[PDB]
Amino acid sequence: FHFPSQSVSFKCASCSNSFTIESTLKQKEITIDICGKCHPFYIG
Amino acid sequence: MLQPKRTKYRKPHNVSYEGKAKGNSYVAFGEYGLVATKGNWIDARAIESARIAISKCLGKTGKMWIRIFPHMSKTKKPLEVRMGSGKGNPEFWVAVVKQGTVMFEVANIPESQMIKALTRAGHKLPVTWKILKREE
Amino acid sequence: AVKRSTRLGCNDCREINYLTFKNVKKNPEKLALNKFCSRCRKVVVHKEVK
Amino acid sequence: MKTRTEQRRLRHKRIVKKIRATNHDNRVVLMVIKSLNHISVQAWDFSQNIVLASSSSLALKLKNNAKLVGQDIADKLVKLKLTNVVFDTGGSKYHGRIAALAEAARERGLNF
Amino acid sequence: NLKAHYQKTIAKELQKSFAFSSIMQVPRLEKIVINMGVGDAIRDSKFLESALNELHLISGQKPVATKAKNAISTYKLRAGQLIGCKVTLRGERMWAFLEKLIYVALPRVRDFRGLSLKSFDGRGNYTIGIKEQIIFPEIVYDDIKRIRGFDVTLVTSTNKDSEALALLRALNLPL
Amino acid sequence: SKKGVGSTKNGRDSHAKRLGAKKADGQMIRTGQIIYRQRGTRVYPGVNVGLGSDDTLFALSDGLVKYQKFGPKQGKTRVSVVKHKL
RNA sequence: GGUCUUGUAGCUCAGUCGGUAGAGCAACGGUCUGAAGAACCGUGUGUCGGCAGUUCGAUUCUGCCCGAGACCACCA
RNA sequence: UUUGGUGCCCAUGUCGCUGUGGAAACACCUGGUUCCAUUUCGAACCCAGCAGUUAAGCACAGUGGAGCCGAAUGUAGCUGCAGUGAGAAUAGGAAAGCACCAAGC
RNA sequence: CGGUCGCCUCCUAAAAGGUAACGGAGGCGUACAAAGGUACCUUCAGUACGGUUGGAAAUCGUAUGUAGAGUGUAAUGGUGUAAGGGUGCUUGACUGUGAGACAUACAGGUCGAACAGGUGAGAAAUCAGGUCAUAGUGAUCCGGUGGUCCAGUAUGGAAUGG
RNA sequence: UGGAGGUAAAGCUACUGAAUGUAUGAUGGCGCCACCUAGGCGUACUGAAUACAAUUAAACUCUGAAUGCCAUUUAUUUUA
Ligand SMILES: [Mg+2]
Ligand SMILES: [Mg+2]
Ligand SMILES: [Mg+2]
Ligand SMILES: [Mg+2]
Ligand SMILES: [Mg+2]
Ligand SMILES: [Mg+2]
Ligand SMILES: [Mg+2]
Ligand SMILES: [Zn+2]
């Protein structure tokens, strides 16, 4: 009854990690440049 | 000149003044006050005259308090006109005074000075006044 | 006065049984109700009649 | 804003006001009440402010789907030869367990 | 999912951290609401349709359009002319959106140095001001004619802010 | 010497409808008779009494009539019809 | 003394019963000219008599005040 | 008698504050697959379940902080100079009460 | 000369009702296929704090807040679980009546139990004969239109009437 | 005996206006600096809101009589 979002995976470009819970899965296993554990506030 | 800034209605009915001084019955701020012994309508002009008299005979030593205030309006049909055809315009405000209301009171100055100041003021008001000292 | 009234009419016996009110200017759609028609002795769809 | 039970109490107050205002006859109401564990019912008669009969899942039953609280209270009422009541949904909605109870009550000679 | 780690460690470690002796005296995050306040649609900026589209794309939760609770003469808004947009999300979508935000969106901001200095309402709630829609991965270069941000909230199951600080810190939120 | 007057502008008033209390306590009444005529429910309906479109109280059955107070600070009023001991 | 009318840009006059201030010249700049006029190009200014209400933003719709204008006022 | 539920009343029935407890119940609470439901959503409603819970609600004790109630006396108004009796202020009271049903007592 | 001529709300109106003046204040000659009927769901305005666009005041979130909010509309009364707000279905904004009362000089005006027919909402109880209530109105006479289990100047029609 | 009622009165932190003194004073007037755009010092003064004490009203009411009114009982009287 809506946009069929699914467990879309992620790809960290620097943290070498991934995230896959649920998102817009039109581009499943998508790449992210700014990694989660890369920002100065998060790490630094 | 004491006067309300603005009101709801411009032509209120007359307010009676034959009672036993609802409110303002006792002195509250000074050690000597002026008390009437016959209720009557006293307008703003007499109020200002008494105020300026007390101020002029007081000096830069004490204070004076005014209790009453001309809230009620009053109408007066113009000159040279038959009656009927509506109600006249408002001309002068007036403070209703029931018999036995403290209305003027001063403090912080010699005792004979209160006596002389209040007696000086009382001769401007139509009502028969009376000197009253603050209770203990 | 304003002539805001209007008359409802049956579509089977074609009587003018009912009368009602309606602002032509706002809703110009002709009323299509279904009330009790005495002559037909049942509930019949009524339409506006000029 | 409320505690998921205060709303139920307010709704029940609304409905009991409705019956107490509309019931020209003296038909005994049938107040069903819904708990997260199980269900219970009492037959409140107005103009007297008493309970004529009552029933509950606490007649040696488990949690509720157990419509026997309809049949037993129907038995009590028909023994008291009333068999005509106004239903009351408490603060709940007429559905599910309440609907099953009401159908069980109706099928055994209640008039509602 | 975040709940995995949440009732894996965080619940009991906060339980032991503060003197509770009650497993669920620990704060629980209740909900997040979404707002953007589309005022440029006085009568027509875009019929808000595109903004509704990205707010639908960010999360399968259907956006709801709000009505003007009053009327303002300064603007062309008078008792209606629906403006704004609200999205309330809970359950698993709540935690999914929370991780997606805190691990993708804010690090992708221009300069996410820190926050949470005083943004609490004072009753255990917090709001983040989002600057632009293009910040989030669930959006294309094409978007509404203008670039608008978001308004999010974090409401806890408590009112005193000490355990609010404790919970937000314990989930690695930037301060 | 006469002068000019006029423009009273305030010489209108409406008919006074006789709203009030048509039935006091201890009165025999038969169904249909109206107890209280008012504008707005200054007197709520109790038991065995009705409320018309015009908010005119009227009994539904035959018996004595009783007034009674209630409400937050004993300010609201019910009027009700008590049956005979038949 | 009463009953109406009007008050808008610098001036003189216009503005769907609600979402709106418009001309001509006056003032500025440039062009022409020995210079000044005249002439040609661009320009510029507008909060609607002052105080109060209805109002979905009142110059606009009503009330009070101010100012002026008008046909008129002691028996006839 | 305790607890739960309900009704009648309407703050002397409130709003708080500090503690005590959950046997049965009462609630949170666990999930949305089923009926049903969200301007959207198991928030609420509705399902089917009791792993944990005294946290909150709930109840019991204390608390007079705010709010509510308020004597007697005197006085204002009346109504033929005696009765009539206010309002305001004050001592003070006040941590609801009344009933039926169900389990344990 | 000016102003007014009917109806509605308040005050004068002296705690039942009624009560005049060229007395004091305001409106009306309506509006609504939903602002009705019904079932269900829900409950203020303002303030404080937090939040980009966005400002004193948009939206949102959390508390406080006994109503200062709302009710198409002048005034009054009433109304916080409502008479206020939303959703689904719908035309009872029905037919024939009407015991009994209200105010009355008359003409007129108002409320209304209850019965029958046939409906709508609701599981049912029940509710629905317009709207929270009070203004939104004009007598006959004359003529015009629709229907018509009526008459038709000797009879059959028709004109013409009821 | 019961009841309806909002007048006399009274009160105004019990609401709508008007309004007195005191205390803290938002705001602004003034001067003031430094700032060309954000603010700071006192502010002869205007004075928000709160607190204490005192007021006023046909069209103000948290309140509030007696008389009067309606009904009823007892007792008496008259055929109105
Ligand atoms: Mg209406
Ligand atoms: Mg309605
Ligand atoms: Mg109407
Ligand atoms: Mg013939
Ligand atoms: Mg013939
Ligand atoms: Mg004919
Ligand atoms: Mg008086
Ligand atoms: Zn027909």
D14 touches strand H (CB under 7 A): no
3-class DSSP state of F40: coil
C37, C44 contact by CB (below 8 A): yes
| For helices D68-79 and D97-107, angle between their N-to-C axes, nearest 10 degrees | 40
Enumerate the residues of chain F whose CB falls inside 8 A of the CB of residue B85.
5-6, 8
Task: Choose the mutation target among E103, E116, E138 for the interface with A, i.e. most A CBs under 10 Å.
Answer: E103
- Neighbour order of strands in the sheet with E125-130: E64-66, E83-89, E29-35, E150-156, E125-130
As a whole number of angstroms, the distance between CA D28 and CA D20 comes to 11
Q: CB neighbours of E24 closer than 8 A, spacing ≥ 6? A: E11
| Rounded Cα gap, residues E136 and E164, in angstroms | 26
E172 touches strand G (CB under 7 A): no
Chain G: positions less than 7 Å from a protein CB are: 1-4, 56-58, 73-75
Candidates B82, B84, B86; nearest CB to F7: B86
**3-state class (DSSP) for residue B22:** coil
> Which residues are paired to C49 by β-bridges?
C7
- How distant is the alpha carbon of residue F11 from its chain centre? 29
- The half-sphere exposure of A27 on its side-chain side, counting CA atoms within 13 A, is 10
**If we measure between CA atoms, which residue out of E51, E9, E49, E7 comes closest to residue E29?**
E7
On chain A, the residues whose CB falls within 8 A of the CB of E62 are 2
Residues 17-56 of E with CB under 7 A from strand I: 33, 35-40, 42
Cα(D27)–Cα(D45) distance, rounded to whole angstroms?
A: 7
Distance from CA of B43 to the nearest CA of F (A): 28
Kindly list the distances between the CA atom of residue B15 and the CA atoms of B71, B93, E94, F56, in Å, as whole numbers in the listed order.
Answer: 11, 12, 70, 38
Interchain CB distance below 8 Å, F8 and B80:
no
Establish whether the CB of C30 is closer than 7 Å to any nucleic acid atom in strand I: no
Q: Tokens in use for E152?
A: 């999010």
| Cross-chain residue pair B82–F2, CB shorter than 8 Å | yes
Confirm whether any atom of chain G, the nucleic acid strand, is less than 7 Å from CB of E70: no
- Give the C-alpha separation, D34 to D4, whole Å: 12
DSSP β-ladder status, B102-107 and B63-66: antiparallel
Q: What is the DSSP string of E25-85?
A: GS--EEEEEEE----S-SS-SSTTHHHHHHHHHSSSSPPEEE--SSEETTTTEES-S-EEE
Q: What 8-state DSSP symbol labels residue C30?
A: P
Strands F64-70 and F76-82: antiparallel
Per-residue tokens: E110:
């221009």
CA dist D105 and D111 (Å) reads 9
Report the distance separating Cα F46 and Cα F81, nearest Å: 8
Are the C-beta atoms of C37 and C43 separated by less than 8 Å?
A: yes
All protein residues with a CB under 7 A from any atom of strand J: B 4-9, 11-13, 15-16, 19-20, 22-26, 28-29, 65-69, 71-72, 96; F 20-21, 23-28, 42-43, 67, 69, 73, 75, 77
HEC profile of D12-36:
HHHHHHHHHHHCCCCCCEEEEEECC
C-alpha–C-alpha distance, residues C2 and E133, integer Å: 55
Half-sphere exposure (Cβ direction) of F72: Cα atoms closer than 13 Å? 0
Q: Rounded CA gap, B26 and B134, in Å?
A: 8
What residue ranges do the domains of chain C occupy?
Answer: 1-50
| Tokens of residue E25, six digits | 């005296």
Q: Which chain B residues touch F7 with a CB distance below 8 Å?
A: 86
Ligand 8 (ion): residues with CB under 5 Å are C 10, 12-13, 37, 39-40, 44
CA distance B13 to chain F (A): 16
| Way the structure was solved | cryo-EM
In a domain, D1, yes or no: no
Nucleotides of J under 7 A from a protein CB: 2-5, 9-12, 16-21, 53-60, 62-63, 69-72
Q: What gap in Å lies between CA E8 and CA C9, rounded to an integer?
A: 74
Residue appearing with tokens 């209108």? F12
- Tell me the three-class secondary structure of chain A, residue by residue: CCCCCECCECCECCCCCCCECCECHHHCCCCECCCHHHCCCCCC
Residue ranges making up the domain that contains D32: 18-112
**Dist. CA F12–CA E158, nearest whole Å:** 63
Query: From the CA of E19, how many Å to the C1' of I134?
Result: 66
**Between β-strands B40-43 and B94-97, what pairing exists: parallel, antiparallel or unpaired?**
antiparallel
Phi, psi of F64 (to 5 degrees): -70, 165
Torsion of CA B81, B85, B91, B94, to 10 degrees: 120
Q: Mutual orientation of helices B44-58 and B111-122 as an angle, nearest 10°?
A: 150
Chain E positions in Cβ-Cβ contact with residue A19 (cut-off 8 Å): 99-100, 103-104
| CB-CB neighbors (< 8 A) of F5 in chain B | 81-82, 84-86
Determine contact: A31 vs chain E, CB below 8 A: no
Q: From the CA of C18, how far away is ligand 7's center (Å)?
A: 58
What is the number of structural domains in chain D?
A: 1
- Among E175, E168, E146, E155, smallest CA distance to E36 is for E146
Q: State the chains in contact with A (3 or more Cβ–Cβ pairs under 8 Å).
A: E
Q: Where are the domains of chain E?
A: 1-175
Rounded to an integer, what distance in angstroms lies between the CA atom of residue D107 and that of residue E9?
54
In a domain, D77, yes or no: yes
Report the distance from CA of residue F32 to the C1' of nucleotide I156 in Å, as an integer.
58
E162 CB contacts (<8 Å, ≥6 apart)?
A: none
Does D2 map to a domain? no
The H or E element that residue D104 is part of is: helix D97-107
Which of the 8 DSSP states describes residue F63?
B
The C-alpha atoms of residue E50 and residue E142 are separated, in whole angstroms, by: 10
**How buried is residue F33: exposed, middle or buried, by Cβ count under 10 Å (0-12/13-18/19+)?**
middle
Report how far Cα B131 is from the mean position of its chain's Cα atoms: 15
Say how far apart CA B132 and CA B129 lie, in whole Å. 10
Whole-number Å distance between alpha carbons of D8 and C41? 47
